[PDB]
Amino acid sequence: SWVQSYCRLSHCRSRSQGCSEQVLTVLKTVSLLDENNVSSYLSKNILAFRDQNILLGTTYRIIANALSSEPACLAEIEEDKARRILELDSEKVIAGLYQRAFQHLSEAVQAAAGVIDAYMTLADFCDQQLRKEEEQAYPALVVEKMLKALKLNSNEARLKFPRLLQIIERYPEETLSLMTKEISSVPCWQFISWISHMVALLDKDQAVAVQHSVEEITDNYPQAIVYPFIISSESYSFKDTSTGHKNKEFVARIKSKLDQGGVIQDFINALDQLSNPELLFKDWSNDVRAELAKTPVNKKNIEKMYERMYAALGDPKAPGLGAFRRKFIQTFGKEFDKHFGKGGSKLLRMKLSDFNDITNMLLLKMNKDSKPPGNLKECSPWMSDFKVEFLRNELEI
Amino acid sequence: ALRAFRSDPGLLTNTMDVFVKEPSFDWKNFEQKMLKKGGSWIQEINVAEKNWYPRQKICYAKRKLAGANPAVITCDELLLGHEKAPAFRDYVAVARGSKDHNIRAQEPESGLSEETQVKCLMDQATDPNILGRTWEGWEPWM
């Protein structure tokens, strides 16, 4: 334990070091390891032996990571130390160092929380090895020990999720079913902070690796999946490949399964039907100028924008059919009867792309005689009379 | 704070990378939020569809956290979005150094240490010319 703590002081000591002094301040620790804390007692206990393997491997990886920006001028005052370097042409010793790191770090996983270190250290070591490669069995080795750690309750493996998300797409051939066979048995509440990745995962390719856990989260904690899903199925297109056919099945199934109370959508409608509508007027004008000024080959997109432009602030009973009317669109569409007459009539397929000046003078006069702070709650009188009623699996903000 | 930061394996690095690689804001939502409110961004883009290229952003952040003079990093950030600028060398000369008015001109350009880094940052933080010229909505006079 004394030599272990001294090597810990060495690694933290080298962490604040400069450049050339790093190899010098660790080689003396290596020569301390060349003495006896090798003398035939780290086989009566396997755990301290495993920590010995981890410290030896990270010592070798620190030696190798030293000369990343410094080629060979650092290896200058070395005769017996150069002999110890060559013991175990500027590349043939660096690769041997990295390989000895791989060896004495894989010996640890070959051997609570005395094993989270052995999993996680090999995980981050092969992670930075692959990060070197993007500038062997790397995806075959990272995911095994990473999910073996994530099965136990941890923070560092929970924060090592989107690296797996990218390594699966980048390496589809490197044991794609392995992460499925390991994700089959996990406590599925260590994903909820990352779940806005997984909700927009499925609209792209290879949702079939992870749908078990998404189904379990929609069963067990159905409130914690809702608000990513409205956005990730708002703009969700599909492709017609063979495995791609059941993807619209599964997303239509989960779509039909959620909002089973059928009240979350009304809550969102109630929250939407209070905002400033002239804000939506400039929104519609600016984002139709963003799409019509280049060329009007926007297939159905002008009418799709008109769907929202008419659904919110159109004919004043269209909100009465889509939702419950407010006490201010009954002012707004009533003054805006002539504003939406020619609006809804000739603003469907005009394709003009240049003129909004009569719209400008009407929107500036629209801000005149209005109090868009509704001064009470009856400015959106769905929520003013809530008075929660019965068993309908309540909202839980 | 900065010394406690930059002795880390780099959870913050890869977390920042998987933030920036989200397929939500790859120039589209940024141009949306630009065109929404005020400013001077209206038009003249043409190269903004490229230059995003998140190896640039993560490489520059990893260098500016892994030891970098903060005049070199802002030089690269100024050049890669404003190459062939009509007024360029005046910009980079004003925000480069003077060798007699600043300490950042009198320092090496990489491999620095922590106290030197925060010192040249605080030197970079103020100038009667850098603060002397900026957009008046930022209100540098206070």
UniProtKB/Swiss-Prot annotation, chain A:
Record PTM N6-acetyllysine, positions in chain: K317, K334, K338
Post-translational modification: Autophosphorylated at two clusters, the T2609 cluster and the S2056 cluster. Autophosphorylation induces a conformational change that leads to remodeling of the DNA-PK complex, requisite for efficient end processing and DNA repair.
Cell compartments where the protein resides: Nucleus; Nucleus, Nucleolus; Cytoplasm, Cytosol
Source organism, top-level taxon: Eukaryota
Cleavable signal peptide: none
Family note: Belongs to the PI3/PI4-kinase family.
Subunit comment: DNA-PK is a heterotrimer of PRKDC and the Ku dimer (composed of XRCC6/Ku70 and XRCC5/Ku86). Formation of this complex may be promoted by interaction with ILF3. Component of the core long-range non-homologous end joining (NHEJ) complex (also named DNA-PK complex) composed of PRKDC, LIG4, XRCC4, XRCC6/Ku70, XRCC5/Ku86 and NHEJ1/XLF. Additional component of the NHEJ complex includes PAXX. Following autophosphorylation, PRKDC dissociates from DNA. Interacts with DNA-PKcs-interacting protein (KIP) with the region upstream the kinase domain.
Known function: Serine/threonine-protein kinase that acts as a molecular sensor for DNA damage. Involved in DNA non-homologous end joining (NHEJ) required for double-strand break (DSB) repair and V(D)J recombination. Must be bound to DNA to express its catalytic properties. Promotes processing of hairpin DNA structures in V(D)J recombination by activation of the hairpin endonuclease artemis (DCLRE1C). Recruited by XRCC5 and XRCC6 to DNA ends and is required to (1) protect and align broken ends of DNA, thereby preventing their degradation, (2) and sequester the DSB for repair by NHEJ.
Name the record gives this protein: DNA-dependent protein kinase catalytic subunit
UniProt source species: Homo sapiens
Full-sequence portion shown in this chain: 3275 to 3701 of 4128
